[PDB]
Short mmCIF file of C-alpha atoms and ligand atoms in Angstrom, two decimals:
data_model
loop_
_atom_site.label_atom_id
_atom_site.label_comp_id
_atom_site.label_asym_id
_atom_site.label_seq_id
_atom_site.Cartn_x
_atom_site.Cartn_y
_atom_site.Cartn_z
CA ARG A 11 2.47 -11.72 -5.61
CA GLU A 12 3.00 -9.79 -1.90
CA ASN A 13 6.69 -9.85 -0.94
CA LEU A 14 8.95 -7.89 1.74
CA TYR A 15 12.46 -6.59 1.18
CA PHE A 16 14.70 -6.25 4.06
CA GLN A 17 18.46 -5.43 3.73
CA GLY A 18 19.10 -6.98 0.63
CA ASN A 19 16.73 -9.72 0.86
CA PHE A 20 13.26 -11.25 -0.29
CA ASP A 21 10.49 -12.91 1.72
CA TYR A 22 6.71 -13.74 0.81
CA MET A 23 4.10 -12.01 2.74
CA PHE A 24 0.16 -13.74 3.19
CA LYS A 25 -2.29 -11.12 1.92
CA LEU A 26 -4.87 -11.11 4.49
CA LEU A 27 -7.86 -9.13 4.00
CA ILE A 28 -11.17 -7.74 5.76
CA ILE A 29 -14.28 -7.52 4.30
CA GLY A 30 -18.08 -7.07 4.46
CA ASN A 31 -20.51 -4.35 4.64
CA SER A 32 -19.90 -0.51 5.69
CA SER A 33 -20.08 0.17 9.19
CA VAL A 34 -19.81 -3.44 10.22
CA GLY A 35 -16.12 -2.72 12.27
CA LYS A 36 -13.73 -3.51 9.67
CA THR A 37 -11.48 -0.46 10.53
CA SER A 38 -11.93 -0.84 14.36
CA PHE A 39 -11.25 -4.23 13.97
CA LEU A 40 -7.91 -3.76 11.87
CA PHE A 41 -7.11 -0.77 14.24
CA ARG A 42 -7.80 -2.67 17.46
CA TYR A 43 -5.57 -5.48 16.15
CA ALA A 44 -2.84 -3.17 15.31
CA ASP A 45 -2.90 -1.50 18.66
CA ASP A 46 -2.94 -4.69 20.45
CA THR A 47 0.90 -5.60 18.40
CA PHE A 48 2.08 -2.22 19.05
CA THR A 49 1.97 -1.87 15.25
CA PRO A 50 1.10 1.14 13.02
CA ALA A 51 -1.68 1.11 10.29
CA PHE A 52 -1.09 3.11 7.09
CA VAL A 53 -4.60 4.69 5.61
CA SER A 54 -4.58 5.87 1.82
CA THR A 55 -7.22 7.77 -0.09
CA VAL A 56 -8.43 6.77 -3.60
CA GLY A 57 -10.93 9.27 -5.46
CA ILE A 58 -12.85 11.68 -3.19
CA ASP A 59 -12.88 9.87 0.07
CA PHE A 60 -12.48 6.11 -0.49
CA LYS A 61 -9.75 4.35 1.99
CA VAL A 62 -7.27 1.56 1.49
CA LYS A 63 -6.07 0.91 5.15
CA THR A 64 -3.14 -1.52 5.45
CA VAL A 65 -1.30 -3.33 8.59
CA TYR A 66 2.08 -4.95 7.80
CA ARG A 67 3.70 -7.50 10.34
CA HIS A 68 7.06 -7.89 9.59
CA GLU A 69 8.41 -11.16 11.64
CA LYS A 70 4.87 -12.90 10.65
CA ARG A 71 5.14 -11.92 7.05
CA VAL A 72 1.29 -10.72 7.00
CA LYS A 73 -0.17 -7.65 4.96
CA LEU A 74 -3.78 -6.98 6.47
CA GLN A 75 -5.84 -4.87 4.47
CA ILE A 76 -9.35 -3.16 4.04
CA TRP A 77 -10.35 -1.48 0.68
CA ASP A 78 -13.68 0.28 1.76
CA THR A 79 -16.54 -1.19 0.44
CA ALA A 80 -18.26 2.10 -0.78
CA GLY A 81 -14.80 2.12 -2.98
CA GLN A 82 -15.03 -1.85 -3.82
CA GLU A 83 -18.46 -0.64 -5.57
CA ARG A 84 -16.59 2.67 -7.73
CA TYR A 85 -13.76 1.06 -8.68
CA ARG A 86 -13.25 -1.83 -10.88
CA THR A 87 -9.50 -2.52 -11.29
CA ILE A 88 -8.63 -1.52 -8.28
CA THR A 89 -11.23 -3.81 -6.49
CA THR A 90 -9.87 -6.64 -8.82
CA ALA A 91 -6.00 -6.30 -8.03
CA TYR A 92 -7.37 -6.15 -4.26
CA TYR A 93 -9.28 -9.22 -4.41
CA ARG A 94 -6.53 -11.22 -6.92
CA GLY A 95 -4.48 -13.67 -4.82
CA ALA A 96 -5.78 -13.04 -1.55
CA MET A 97 -4.79 -16.01 0.95
CA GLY A 98 -7.25 -15.66 3.70
CA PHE A 99 -10.65 -13.33 4.54
CA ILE A 100 -12.24 -12.10 7.67
CA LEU A 101 -15.71 -12.18 6.39
CA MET A 102 -17.14 -9.38 8.76
CA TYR A 103 -20.97 -8.81 9.80
CA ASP A 104 -22.55 -6.97 12.46
CA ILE A 105 -24.66 -9.09 15.31
CA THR A 106 -26.69 -5.73 15.71
CA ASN A 107 -27.27 -5.24 12.09
CA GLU A 108 -29.46 -8.10 9.94
CA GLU A 109 -28.24 -6.52 6.61
CA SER A 110 -25.07 -7.14 7.42
CA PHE A 111 -25.77 -10.53 7.98
CA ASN A 112 -27.98 -10.91 4.87
CA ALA A 113 -25.09 -9.82 2.93
CA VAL A 114 -22.67 -12.61 3.84
CA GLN A 115 -23.78 -14.92 0.98
CA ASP A 116 -22.79 -12.29 -1.61
CA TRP A 117 -19.39 -11.75 0.26
CA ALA A 118 -19.18 -15.21 0.12
CA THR A 119 -19.54 -15.48 -3.68
CA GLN A 120 -17.02 -12.46 -4.01
CA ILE A 121 -14.34 -14.51 -2.28
CA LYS A 122 -14.21 -17.45 -4.64
CA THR A 123 -15.04 -15.25 -8.11
CA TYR A 124 -11.60 -12.90 -7.37
CA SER A 125 -9.53 -14.94 -5.12
CA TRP A 126 -7.27 -17.76 -4.67
CA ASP A 127 -8.93 -21.22 -5.07
CA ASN A 128 -7.59 -22.39 -1.51
CA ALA A 129 -8.06 -18.84 0.62
CA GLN A 130 -9.49 -19.25 3.94
CA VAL A 131 -12.18 -17.34 5.05
CA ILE A 132 -13.24 -16.59 8.86
CA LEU A 133 -17.09 -15.26 9.15
CA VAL A 134 -16.72 -12.79 12.18
CA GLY A 135 -19.97 -11.46 13.90
CA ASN A 136 -18.66 -8.05 15.29
CA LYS A 137 -19.78 -6.18 17.95
CA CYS A 138 -20.52 -8.53 20.41
CA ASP A 139 -20.21 -6.42 23.28
CA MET A 140 -23.76 -4.85 22.36
CA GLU A 141 -25.94 -7.70 23.29
CA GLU A 142 -28.77 -5.72 24.27
CA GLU A 143 -28.85 -4.79 20.24
CA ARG A 144 -28.66 -8.14 18.61
CA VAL A 145 -30.85 -9.23 16.11
CA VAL A 146 -28.68 -11.86 14.66
CA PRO A 147 -28.29 -15.12 16.80
CA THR A 148 -25.07 -17.00 16.72
CA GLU A 149 -26.62 -20.01 15.64
CA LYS A 150 -27.29 -18.41 12.50
CA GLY A 151 -23.74 -17.23 12.00
CA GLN A 152 -22.51 -20.68 13.19
CA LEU A 153 -24.71 -22.33 10.79
CA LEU A 154 -24.20 -20.28 7.55
CA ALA A 155 -20.49 -20.76 7.97
CA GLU A 156 -20.88 -24.45 8.18
CA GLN A 157 -22.99 -24.64 4.97
CA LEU A 158 -20.38 -22.20 3.27
CA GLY A 159 -17.05 -23.76 4.42
CA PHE A 160 -16.00 -21.23 6.74
CA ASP A 161 -14.31 -20.88 10.42
CA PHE A 162 -16.64 -19.09 12.66
CA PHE A 163 -16.56 -16.26 15.90
CA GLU A 164 -18.11 -13.58 17.21
CA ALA A 165 -15.82 -10.77 18.06
CA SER A 166 -15.81 -6.69 19.36
CA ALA A 167 -13.18 -4.54 18.10
CA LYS A 168 -14.19 -2.42 21.07
CA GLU A 169 -13.55 -4.60 23.66
CA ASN A 170 -10.80 -6.50 22.20
CA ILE A 171 -12.85 -10.08 22.15
CA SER A 172 -11.30 -12.50 19.75
CA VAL A 173 -9.54 -9.97 17.62
CA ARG A 174 -5.97 -11.63 17.77
CA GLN A 175 -7.98 -14.99 17.65
CA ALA A 176 -8.92 -14.01 14.51
CA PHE A 177 -5.93 -13.53 12.51
CA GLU A 178 -3.69 -15.95 14.00
CA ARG A 179 -6.60 -18.30 13.40
CA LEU A 180 -6.57 -17.59 9.63
CA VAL A 181 -2.82 -17.98 9.37
CA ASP A 182 -3.02 -21.04 10.64
CA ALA A 183 -6.01 -22.52 8.20
CA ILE A 184 -3.72 -21.11 5.45
CA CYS A 185 -0.61 -23.30 6.30
CA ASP A 186 -2.82 -26.09 7.19
CA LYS A 187 -4.25 -26.22 3.59
CA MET A 188 -0.82 -26.05 2.00
CA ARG B 11 -5.10 11.95 1.82
CA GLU B 12 -1.74 9.57 3.52
CA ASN B 13 -2.43 9.07 6.90
CA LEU B 14 -0.73 7.22 9.87
CA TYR B 15 -2.58 5.55 12.81
CA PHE B 16 -0.79 4.63 15.81
CA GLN B 17 -2.35 3.45 19.07
CA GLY B 18 -5.44 5.50 18.80
CA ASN B 19 -4.17 8.26 17.06
CA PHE B 20 -3.51 9.72 13.60
CA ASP B 21 -1.46 11.84 11.81
CA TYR B 22 -0.35 12.76 8.45
CA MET B 23 2.31 11.42 5.87
CA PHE B 24 4.32 13.07 2.71
CA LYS B 25 3.40 10.97 -0.03
CA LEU B 26 6.54 10.78 -2.10
CA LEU B 27 6.84 9.35 -5.80
CA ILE B 28 9.70 7.98 -7.38
CA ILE B 29 8.97 7.99 -11.58
CA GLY B 30 10.88 7.77 -14.54
CA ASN B 31 11.60 5.43 -17.51
CA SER B 32 12.04 1.69 -16.86
CA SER B 33 15.26 0.30 -15.84
CA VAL B 34 16.57 3.81 -14.98
CA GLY B 35 17.18 2.45 -11.09
CA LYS B 36 13.76 3.43 -9.37
CA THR B 37 13.78 0.26 -7.32
CA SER B 38 17.21 0.05 -6.76
CA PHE B 39 16.99 3.66 -5.38
CA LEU B 40 14.12 3.04 -3.15
CA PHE B 41 15.75 -0.15 -1.96
CA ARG B 42 19.45 1.31 -1.10
CA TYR B 43 17.49 4.01 1.02
CA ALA B 44 15.61 1.76 2.92
CA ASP B 45 18.41 -0.56 3.38
CA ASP B 46 20.58 2.81 4.46
CA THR B 47 17.89 3.41 7.25
CA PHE B 48 17.32 -0.04 8.71
CA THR B 49 13.97 -0.18 6.88
CA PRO B 50 11.51 -2.89 5.09
CA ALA B 51 9.95 -2.19 1.44
CA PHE B 52 7.14 -3.65 0.76
CA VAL B 53 6.34 -4.90 -3.15
CA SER B 54 2.52 -5.63 -4.28
CA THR B 55 1.77 -7.29 -7.58
CA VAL B 56 -0.94 -5.79 -9.89
CA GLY B 57 -2.14 -7.52 -13.29
CA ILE B 58 0.39 -10.18 -14.48
CA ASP B 59 3.87 -8.61 -13.19
CA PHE B 60 3.19 -4.91 -12.29
CA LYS B 61 4.91 -3.99 -9.20
CA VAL B 62 3.96 -1.46 -6.45
CA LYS B 63 7.15 -0.80 -3.84
CA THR B 64 6.13 0.94 -0.85
CA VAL B 65 8.60 2.17 2.14
CA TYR B 66 7.01 3.90 5.01
CA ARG B 67 9.11 6.07 7.43
CA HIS B 68 7.11 6.41 10.66
CA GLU B 69 9.07 9.13 12.72
CA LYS B 70 9.39 11.09 9.49
CA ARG B 71 6.31 10.72 8.43
CA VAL B 72 6.63 9.73 4.82
CA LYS B 73 5.54 7.48 2.42
CA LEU B 74 7.60 6.53 -0.62
CA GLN B 75 6.22 4.73 -3.47
CA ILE B 76 7.17 3.62 -7.04
CA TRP B 77 4.21 2.06 -9.50
CA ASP B 78 5.88 0.69 -12.39
CA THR B 79 6.55 2.95 -15.44
CA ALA B 80 5.17 -0.42 -17.38
CA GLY B 81 2.27 -0.54 -15.12
CA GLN B 82 1.19 3.48 -15.51
CA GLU B 83 0.93 2.65 -19.30
CA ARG B 84 -1.58 -0.17 -18.55
CA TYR B 85 -3.75 0.84 -15.62
CA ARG B 86 -5.44 4.35 -16.07
CA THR B 87 -7.23 4.47 -12.78
CA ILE B 88 -4.56 2.69 -10.71
CA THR B 89 -2.09 5.30 -12.13
CA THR B 90 -4.63 8.92 -11.74
CA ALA B 91 -4.81 7.25 -7.63
CA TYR B 92 -0.92 7.09 -7.23
CA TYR B 93 -0.08 10.64 -8.96
CA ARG B 94 -3.32 12.37 -7.19
CA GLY B 95 -2.05 14.16 -4.12
CA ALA B 96 1.86 13.52 -4.51
CA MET B 97 3.62 16.25 -2.37
CA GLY B 98 7.06 15.36 -3.96
CA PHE B 99 9.00 13.76 -6.79
CA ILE B 100 12.15 11.93 -7.57
CA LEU B 101 12.15 12.33 -11.45
CA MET B 102 14.85 9.77 -12.32
CA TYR B 103 16.68 9.10 -15.49
CA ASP B 104 20.03 7.23 -15.93
CA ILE B 105 23.09 9.13 -17.02
CA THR B 106 24.36 5.94 -19.47
CA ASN B 107 20.92 6.11 -21.23
CA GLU B 108 19.94 9.23 -23.48
CA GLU B 109 16.47 8.31 -24.01
CA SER B 110 15.74 8.12 -20.49
CA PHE B 111 16.78 11.67 -20.35
CA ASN B 112 14.50 12.64 -23.42
CA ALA B 113 11.78 11.47 -21.41
CA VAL B 114 12.21 13.79 -18.92
CA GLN B 115 10.00 16.66 -20.55
CA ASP B 116 7.31 14.32 -20.60
CA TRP B 117 7.49 13.14 -17.03
CA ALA B 118 7.38 16.94 -16.21
CA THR B 119 3.90 17.13 -17.91
CA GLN B 120 2.90 13.99 -15.96
CA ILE B 121 3.92 15.71 -12.48
CA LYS B 122 1.93 19.09 -13.37
CA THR B 123 -1.08 17.24 -14.73
CA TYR B 124 -2.16 14.77 -12.10
CA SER B 125 -0.20 15.79 -8.94
CA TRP B 126 -0.42 18.81 -6.19
CA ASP B 127 0.06 22.60 -7.66
CA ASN B 128 3.07 22.97 -5.25
CA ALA B 129 4.47 19.52 -5.53
CA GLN B 130 8.29 19.31 -5.27
CA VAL B 131 10.66 17.73 -7.62
CA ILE B 132 14.41 16.50 -7.79
CA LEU B 133 15.69 15.40 -11.00
CA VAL B 134 18.18 12.81 -10.27
CA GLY B 135 20.42 11.62 -12.86
CA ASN B 136 21.14 7.84 -11.62
CA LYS B 137 23.90 5.38 -12.29
CA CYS B 138 26.63 7.81 -11.83
CA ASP B 139 29.10 5.28 -10.79
CA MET B 140 29.09 4.28 -14.37
CA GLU B 141 31.37 7.24 -15.98
CA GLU B 142 32.77 5.10 -18.54
CA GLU B 143 29.05 4.64 -20.01
CA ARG B 144 27.68 7.91 -19.64
CA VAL B 145 25.82 9.66 -22.63
CA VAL B 146 24.24 12.51 -20.41
CA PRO B 147 26.66 15.19 -19.62
CA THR B 148 25.81 16.83 -16.18
CA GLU B 149 25.55 20.45 -17.65
CA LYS B 150 22.13 19.23 -19.64
CA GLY B 151 20.65 17.51 -16.35
CA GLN B 152 21.67 20.92 -14.60
CA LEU B 153 19.78 22.72 -16.85
CA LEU B 154 16.53 21.12 -17.81
CA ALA B 155 16.28 20.98 -13.94
CA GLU B 156 16.46 25.02 -14.24
CA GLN B 157 14.02 25.61 -17.06
CA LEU B 158 11.53 23.13 -15.16
CA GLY B 159 12.03 24.83 -11.84
CA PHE B 160 13.45 21.20 -10.16
CA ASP B 161 16.37 20.73 -7.94
CA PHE B 162 19.06 18.36 -9.62
CA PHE B 163 21.68 15.96 -8.27
CA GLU B 164 23.61 13.07 -9.70
CA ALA B 165 23.34 9.83 -7.81
CA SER B 166 24.02 6.20 -7.40
CA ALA B 167 22.07 3.67 -6.07
CA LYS B 168 24.65 1.06 -6.18
CA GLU B 169 27.41 3.07 -4.40
CA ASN B 170 25.16 4.73 -2.22
CA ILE B 171 25.75 8.21 -3.36
CA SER B 172 23.25 11.04 -2.98
CA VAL B 173 20.58 8.26 -1.90
CA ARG B 174 19.80 9.97 1.34
CA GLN B 175 20.81 13.59 0.26
CA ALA B 176 17.38 13.13 -2.36
CA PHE B 177 14.47 12.17 -0.05
CA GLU B 178 15.61 14.75 2.96
CA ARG B 179 16.29 17.34 0.30
CA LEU B 180 12.76 16.76 -1.21
CA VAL B 181 10.72 16.86 2.32
CA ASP B 182 12.77 20.19 3.25
CA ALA B 183 11.73 21.91 -0.21
CA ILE B 184 8.04 20.39 0.38
CA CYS B 185 8.00 22.23 4.15
CA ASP B 186 10.03 25.22 3.01
CA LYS B 187 7.15 26.04 0.35
CA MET B 188 4.55 25.61 3.05
N1 LIG K 1 -20.28 -1.19 20.27
C1 LIG K 1 -19.13 -1.79 19.11
N2 LIG K 1 -19.02 -0.81 17.90
C2 LIG K 1 -18.39 -0.89 17.10
C3 LIG K 1 -17.40 -2.05 17.06
N3 LIG K 1 -16.58 -2.12 15.68
C4 LIG K 1 -17.19 -0.81 15.28
N4 LIG K 1 -18.02 0.18 15.80
C5 LIG K 1 -18.42 1.06 15.66
O1 LIG K 1 -19.34 0.60 14.21
C6 LIG K 1 -19.18 2.26 13.36
C7 LIG K 1 -18.48 1.23 12.22
O2 LIG K 1 -17.09 1.08 12.63
P1 LIG K 1 -15.97 0.99 11.27
O3 LIG K 1 -14.82 0.34 11.54
O4 LIG K 1 -15.82 2.31 10.68
O5 LIG K 1 -16.73 0.06 10.18
P2 LIG K 1 -16.34 -0.05 8.57
O6 LIG K 1 -17.12 1.03 7.97
O7 LIG K 1 -16.53 -1.67 8.35
O8 LIG K 1 -14.48 0.10 8.62
C8 LIG K 1 -18.18 2.70 14.22
O9 LIG K 1 -18.98 3.81 14.54
C9 LIG K 1 -17.25 2.32 15.41
O10 LIG K 1 -16.88 2.78 16.27
C10 LIG K 1 -17.25 -2.98 18.35
O11 LIG K 1 -16.75 -4.22 18.41
N5 LIG K 1 -18.49 -2.45 19.09
N1 LIG K 2 25.65 0.67 -11.83
C1 LIG K 2 24.53 0.68 -11.71
N2 LIG K 2 23.35 0.31 -11.80
C2 LIG K 2 22.24 0.46 -11.44
C3 LIG K 2 22.03 1.46 -10.72
N3 LIG K 2 20.56 1.53 -10.23
C4 LIG K 2 20.08 0.70 -10.82
N4 LIG K 2 20.77 0.04 -11.47
C5 LIG K 2 20.61 -1.56 -12.21
O1 LIG K 2 19.89 -0.94 -13.43
C6 LIG K 2 18.68 -2.05 -13.67
C7 LIG K 2 17.75 -1.57 -13.56
O2 LIG K 2 17.24 -1.27 -12.26
P1 LIG K 2 15.94 -1.08 -11.41
O3 LIG K 2 16.11 -0.64 -10.21
O4 LIG K 2 14.88 -2.33 -11.60
O5 LIG K 2 15.29 0.20 -12.54
P2 LIG K 2 13.42 0.37 -12.22
O6 LIG K 2 12.94 -0.32 -13.67
O7 LIG K 2 13.41 2.00 -12.53
O8 LIG K 2 12.84 -0.07 -11.02
C8 LIG K 2 19.16 -3.24 -12.83
O9 LIG K 2 19.99 -4.14 -13.45
C9 LIG K 2 19.88 -2.25 -11.58
O10 LIG K 2 20.65 -3.21 -11.12
C10 LIG K 2 23.24 2.32 -10.19
O11 LIG K 2 23.03 3.25 -9.40
N5 LIG K 2 24.40 1.75 -10.70
#
């Protein structure tokens, strides 16, 4: 369902999705990864101002994509195409925002409904640079990740803490499964 | 509505679309351009087997995209997002297929309805390598192109005849307009 074409030849791509509440740092996290790896990102607009943000890694055969949460709430068909056949997820919350963490069960259900049976998930508590504003203890994140069957890390898009770790670890979980 | 992000910075991209009847050579034409320029193309699946095929040129700031005709017939919202804010079109027919040429008025209406007011269009008679199978005289293509306000070329994706000419000429029409 996701392919790369180059010089007459085709190969598969891993569809990896970053999801979570508006304003948890999904775009920042994707863009920090792009910047870290000297890769461009592409941003396309749907409707008034809803965004699709995409990074392609050629050698590594991964497509990383955000379809904004506010967009997912407005467009059913675009959203189901977005989730359909996703291989892995970064499921993101903000350690400084309790509601974003409370939404995780709901995002978990989203993953199982719409995406591949064996899709691997990493729960990421983002904004770990903002310790002074934390409201979600690390132990809550670790324990939910355990009961939902996800991997778990805290990260910082702003400080480049555990940004690469996330995607390389996700592809590894995917390959190990298959 | 189409942006590139690279190393902390943003710029605009030109959204260029290739449209026309199934099997006129749109994919072949896009892929030949990708191959000519040492660029990858990306192919994403919507529904059972409907494809979105995309080439990005970074330096030149152009996004070239096919959303399969059979897909356009099935998914309204995806299709309107596809056309919305298109800057230019390659409107393709097959010189060996009369129906594909008869559809051109209908594709022309499509362009005006759904896309930018000043969107530039090139009418391309593809498969010009197959002279022995021609059923659409060049003069018909030239005359329709004149009455619809389009540029016009015959081309061959298979033989690499007028493939680059098409996109570089399209961006030029776009810039000249603005
Ligand atoms: N301190 C800090 N702020 C962040 C981090 N990631 C994102 N932000 C900020 O959180 C807000 C939302 O980020 P954004 O990437 O747009 O979130 P999205 O809506 O989930 O895509 C913005 O003001 C970002 O600058 C982080 O790691 N640390
Ligand atoms: N002879 C010739 N055949 C072509 C050319 N372009 C496409 N084709 C063939 O026409 C058929 C449809 O091409 P495709 O690129 O899939 O058309 P699309 O459905 O419009 O994307 C395929 O068998 C292609 O190999 C061309 O320039 N010359």
